[PDB]
Amino acid sequence: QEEVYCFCRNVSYGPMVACDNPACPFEWFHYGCVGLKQAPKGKWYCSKDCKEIANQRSKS
């Protein structure tokens, strides 16, 4: 695909992942955008926040 996902103003070059979090302002982020490889544990949180934001919600 050729668009623009992560807040890095770019799109899916190859290794990608969606904000596997209920909140997460978006559902598509690049590894160059964030920080990881092959999306650790299979599921990765769109951003260091996309993870924390999920912790702030759902069961406290």
**Would you count residue 17 as binding Zn ion (CB under 5 A)?**
no
DSSP strands (E only) in the chain: 16-17, 29-30
Q: By CB under 5 A, is residue 6 in contact with Zn ion?
A: yes
Return the residues of window 18-47 that contact Zn ion according to CB under 5 A: 19, 24, 33, 46
Which of 8, 13, 35, 43 lies at the binding interface for Zn ion (CB under 5 A)?
A: 8
CB of 20 to Zn ion, least distance (A): 8
Instruction: Give the integer Cα–Cα distance in Å for 28 and 21.
Output: 11
Structure-block tokens of residue 43: 């599921």
